[PDB]
Write an enzyme that holds these catalytic residues in place. Sequence first.
Site, PDB file in Angstrom:
ATOM      1  CD  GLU A  35     -23.440 -25.801  -9.957  1.00 20.07           C
ATOM      2  OE1 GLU A  35     -23.219 -24.610  -9.775  1.00 20.07           O
ATOM      3  OE2 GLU A  35     -23.553 -26.306 -11.074  1.00 20.07           O
ATOM      4  CG  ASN A  46     -26.185 -16.235 -12.580  1.00 21.02           C
ATOM      5  OD1 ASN A  46     -25.012 -16.643 -12.524  1.00 21.02           O
ATOM      6  ND2 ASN A  46     -27.228 -16.956 -12.164  1.00 21.02           N
ATOM      7  CG  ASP A  48     -29.315 -14.137 -16.141  1.00 15.60           C
ATOM      8  OD1 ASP A  48     -28.790 -14.273 -15.032  1.00 15.60           O
ATOM      9  OD2 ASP A  48     -29.986 -15.071 -16.658  1.00 15.60           O
ATOM     10  CB  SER A  50     -31.218 -15.007 -12.900  1.00 19.81           C
ATOM     11  OG  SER A  50     -29.942 -15.557 -13.248  1.00 19.81           O
ATOM     12  CG  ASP A  52     -27.019 -19.627 -10.125  1.00 16.58           C
ATOM     13  OD1 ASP A  52     -28.051 -19.835 -10.730  1.00 16.58           O
ATOM     14  OD2 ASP A  52     -25.949 -19.317 -10.668  1.00 16.58           O
ATOM     15  CG  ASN A  59     -31.263 -19.205 -12.755  1.00 17.25           C
ATOM     16  OD1 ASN A  59     -32.154 -18.796 -13.499  1.00 17.25           O
ATOM     17  ND2 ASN A  59     -30.198 -18.460 -12.528  1.00 17.25           N
TER      18      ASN A  59
END
Length: 129
Positions: A35, A46, A48, A50, A52, A59
């Site tokens: 990750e 991301n 969208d 959003s 991480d 998220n």
Amino acid sequence: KVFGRCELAAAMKRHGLDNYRGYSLGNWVCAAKFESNFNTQATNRNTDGSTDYGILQINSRWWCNDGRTPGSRNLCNIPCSALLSSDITASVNCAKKIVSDGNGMNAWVAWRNRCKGTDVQAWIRGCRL
């Protein structure tokens, strides 16, 4: 901050992740490896809107507040910036809620793709725990 493998493994064990919800320490170390590559400052935006954050890429859409995710919740009740600290505590505590949210460790796409069904015990090799 970038953890050495056994270093992070130790830090994870101290925070109670080993066999947490039946998930062995190796699982946790593997997930963190794919990750964020053991980098507490890793961030990934991301499409969208959003983002991480941290060693376990949590998220901003549902777990933390980064104040720029449109229909965002803050289940973990924290600033996403806190997930970027050198100390693992906020991430692990939030990770604990995410793994009990009904999908087990599948919540982490890299764990699912690179650790799932694997010999995860390797990730713990040469570590004095």
